[PDB]
Amino acid sequence: SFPVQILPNLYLGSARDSANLESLAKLGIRYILNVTPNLPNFFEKNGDFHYKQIPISDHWSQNLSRFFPEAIEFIDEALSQNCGVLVHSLAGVSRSVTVTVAYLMQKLHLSLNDAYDLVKRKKSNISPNFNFMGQLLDFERSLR
Numbered sequence: 001s002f003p004v005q006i007l008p009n010l011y012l013g014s015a016r017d018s019a020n021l022e023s024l025a026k027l028g029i030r031y032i033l034n035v036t037p038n039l040p041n042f043f044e045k046n047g048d049f050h051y052k053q054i055p056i057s058d059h060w061s062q063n064l065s066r067f068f069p070e071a072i073e074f075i076d077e078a079l080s081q082n083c084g085v086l087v088h089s090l091a092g093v094s095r096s097v098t099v100t101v102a103y104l105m106q107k108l109h110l111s112l113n114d115a116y117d118l119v120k121r122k123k124s125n126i127s128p129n130f131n132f133m134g135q136l137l138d139f140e141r142s143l144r
Helices: 021-026 058-080 095-108 112-122 130-143
Strands: 004-007 010-013 029-034 050-053 084-088
Touching: 004 095, 004 112, 010 058, 010 095, 029 058, 050 058, 058 084, 058 095, 058 130, 084 095, 095 112, 095 130, 112 130
Parallel strands: 010 084, 029 050, 029 084
Antiparallel strands: 004 010
């Protein structure tokens, strides 16, 4: 129905949200971060949209932190251009959330928990994944 907004211009959603051209127009979203190895980038042929896809999966949760830097860079481009960006996965209750938490951690200088609290308050359906949590803690460490 609608992706939830986390920070101004930063939206968190599902694969359903990624295919709703009407919903993306309403929210001013022109950037889409597809955090799955296989979901479609519906409006790829549309020069107005900017796509970025990262093959994140629980099958290989150990590679995650490695993708945080390019994800954060993409989200920053959207926000710097003062454009909305949608971060999504399939159900959108784990992979998209993890990447979004990582972004918050870096930009707002927040610990994993504080960053997580911001998302929890906006989204009530988050599924735990300790491998992902461990990856976030490693990232928390790299930030210091």
